[PDB]
């Protein structure tokens, strides 16, 4: 250490001729013991190299090579300094990279190399990706945009843009964003892009602009609309003039879609329904429709003749926004009719299909009949063409749209009935084709569900014999045929259908139903209902049970404009058929059992068949045919248990040969199947009873083997910016398998308590908690973070809480984990989202021992640390939203704040008082989440109300906070946003509280004149 420093000082003090050899001497001076003893410093040798460079650069073109050399040297040094871990501090290295490229004296290749080091070594490391402050991000963005905007053109310009694309992604996701005054830069980069044909970095500049606009859309929406009005004509001109590179057009389409989303949130058409309108925007919309219409009739817009879907969605959005120069469905019908070849006809079919599906009200009922006639004329060509699957999908969308309308005239309905009968006649013939089985059966199901065509006896012949194989579309059409019709008697047809569904090929192909996954409890319901006295009643009874991006910004816009307000809103069975079904099931199960081999036979097929058996039993037990106790003694249960035993030995084999990789593919599939076999929902349904039967299937040995393999698997050892540590690309096949079996074990432990099972849930839960033991758990490891997060999310349950010791063990590693990932915003948000599920077990103070108090304090200190850091401006709006959600859950679990008090700096804060503070936040999303969730302060929400004084003081504090947020105030967007929060809070209080109704109404009356609330808006709220 000291000797190395002395040698470095001597080399630095040597003469230039001596320094020439001293460079190589210092390069070779590094060694493994030197690095081992140097772990802390590296900054000392960094400044040594820095003054060496500053002295060398001062002393023609002959210097250029030297520069290259020294560049390589520092690069090599960096690669040697940060190879094992990022020991080198980000700050001074960032300033060095800043000022080496800031000056123009350095060579262009030197600047390109320095930018290469910046991109590949600084911005590619998560730690440096996080420790960069907001000022550093803004200065790097500014200087690099100045570099890009320079008139000098080289290859490195492209590499400049890739830096900016990175920098913006680092500025919009790790800090509170960059100021809106930076919108000029991009605008400049756009305007010059009009002149130069090269457009070296436009592909990355526009992609970074998309991220900036997405971040800058929650606030300053009018500013973004004006920016779009400014730049969109230039983008249209670029599209028309440019060489049309696929990446550039793809990014431009994304920008156009973002602009449409911002202007028309979720299809808002009129200004009074949430849309923002301008004359320039309307002209832009018409020009962009013309551009898309022209560009669609191109070879590259798509062997395959289908236009890429993003173009189709953009075209459909534009058409919906410009349909009422006159535009309408007339041009679509004309293009559908006149076009001869399928090249120019498929795009219009796709446009019509997407427009009808996304906007069912966009097609007038007067034009429905001509469209149906055109589609019927387009169906047949005596054979199967390229256009047929698209025509079938368009017809399916039309059929689904028709059934959603009740204002249809009788003459119109009777005319459409004839066309639908003709359509059925056309499509039913030619159903034997395997290529369009999905589309054909989808059209048939759409027609049947709406009762558009009376089902004939020929239809029921489809699900018999070898006419068609059992598939998801065919079974989904059959489950609607049973729902909306009665099977004819051609004891014979029902038995034939049951045999067709359960037809097993004798002696080695698996039956088709076992081969492919089917929707849960869909085959079982059909099979059970086919044996019932009244098939249609059984189907309807089964169907009557209840089941268990930029969209958020559009919802926030709608809430801000107040167009969206979430608040203020026994049977009898044919014995012969029942026994025939049991005979078929026994035959299939024993056929699987005998054909099963310990090595070659698949495992997910056995699990699928056992799922079918237990689903049939659960469907029978849901009705009055069979009780649970008798179902436990049925031969179907024994066959399912044997199937489970056969499947378990596949896991048992893997328990020893963990090194295998081909086993993992099947093991993951079978784990997913077993996971979806269960159901955590508690409402009585066939799903719950089937899940109970499947729970009783599992044995103790299989569960112990799964737990042992999970224990073993945890002991093992391009992208724009740095990779998220929670990213899926860090997960190997074994890691994914471990995550699957961990979820399966968690579900089994959670839902075992309701029934009586062969395995002990306590031991498995003890092993699961042993997985996150302090000695073994390494939070920095990617797999261990996922495992801990999954355990935090899945283990707690309000209905049957964890023992307080188990909850204490669960929260034990939380503080260290949060300390480790303090600077990572995404990981902090995920941790806050996942720790919210502990509050349900935490809240119950029935066993108010030392353990309950300890667990409550342990959770509250972690939440208080996050709140204190948030007040210290250490977290972005996403972490603030996660914290608001956690505080909302705490308020739900303790309305009176008996125990939900967080202590910071020796000061106690009730959660109710803290939650009000977020009403005056600097981000509109957090404000409108707090305002929308403020109803927890007025009702128990466990729907009893709260005491008079508590409600009064809560409303007074919330109203004062909302007023204060307004008071401390180009800026039109902020004013509108603050008024929206005030009005939303008052409306929520009015809707959720009869005690404070008069007070809220008087507050609204006062704020109409004091805070300048727009009367036309509060009137709209008051009408609702």
Swiss-Prot record:
Principal location listed in the UniProt entry: nucleus
UniProt PTM: Phosphorylated by NUAK1/ARK5. During the late stages of DNA damage response, dephosphorylated following deacetylation by SIRT7, leading to ATM deactivation.
Effect of mutating residue 19 to Q: In a colorectal adenocarcinoma sample; somatic mutation
UniProt GO molecular function: 1-phosphatidylinositol-3-kinase activity; ATP binding; DNA binding; DNA-dependent protein kinase activity; histone H2AXS139 kinase activity; identical protein binding; protein serine kinase activity; protein serine/threonine kinase activity
Induction per the UniProt record: By ionizing radiation.
Effect of residue 303 to C: In a colorectal adenocarcinoma sample; somatic mutation
Effect of residue 482 to V: No effect on phosphorylation of target proteins
Result for mutant: residue 318 to T: In B-cell chronic lymphocytic leukemia
The organism's place on the tree of life at top rank: Eukaryota
Keyword list, A-Z: Acetylation, ATP-binding, Cell cycle, Cytoplasm, Cytoplasmic vesicle, Cytoskeleton, Disease variant, DNA damage, DNA-binding, Kinase, Neurodegeneration, Nucleotide-binding, Nucleus, Peroxisome, Phosphoprotein, Serine/threonine-protein kinase, Transferase, Tumor suppressor
Phenotype upon changing residue 590 to G: Found in a patient with familial pancreatic cancer; uncertain significance
UniProt-reported outcome of changing residue 923 to L: In AT; uncertain significance
Entry's localization field: Nucleus; Cytoplasmic vesicle; Cytoplasm, Cytoskeleton, Microtubule organizing center, Centrosome; Peroxisome matrix
Disease: Ataxia telangiectasia: A rare recessive disorder characterized by progressive cerebellar ataxia, dilation of the blood vessels in the conjunctiva and eyeballs, immunodeficiency, growth retardation and sexual immaturity. Patients have a strong predisposition to cancer; about 30% of patients develop tumors, particularly lymphomas and leukemias. Cells from affected individuals are highly sensitive to damage by ionizing radiation and resistant to inhibition of DNA synthesis following irradiation. Defects in ATM may contribute to T-cell acute lymphoblastic leukemia (TALL) and T-prolymphocytic leukemia (TPLL). TPLL is characterized by a high white blood cell count, with a predominance of prolymphocytes, marked splenomegaly, lymphadenopathy, skin lesions and serous effusion. The clinical course is highly aggressive, with poor response to chemotherapy and short survival time. TPLL occurs both in adults as a sporadic disease and in younger AT patients.
Primary role: Serine/threonine protein kinase which activates checkpoint signaling upon double strand breaks (DSBs), apoptosis and genotoxic stresses such as ionizing ultraviolet A light (UVA), thereby acting as a DNA damage sensor. Recognizes the substrate consensus sequence [ST]-Q. Phosphorylates 'Ser-139' of histone variant H2AX at double strand breaks (DSBs), thereby regulating DNA damage response mechanism.
Subunit structure: Homodimer. Dimers or tetramers in inactive state. On DNA damage, autophosphorylation dissociates ATM into monomers rendering them catalytically active. Binds p53/TP53, ABL1, BRCA1 and TERF1. Interacts with NBN (via FxF/Y motif). Part of the BRCA1-associated genome surveillance complex (BASC), which contains BRCA1, MSH2, MSH6, MLH1, ATM, BLM, PMS2 and the RAD50-MRE11-NBN protein complex. This association could be a dynamic process changing throughout the cell cycle and within subnuclear domains. Interacts with RAD17; DNA damage promotes the association.
Protein name: Serine-protein kinase ATM
Organism: Homo sapiens (Human)
Lineage of source species: Eukaryota, Metazoa, Chordata, Craniata, Vertebrata
Full-length numbering of the shown residues: 5 to 1196 of 3056
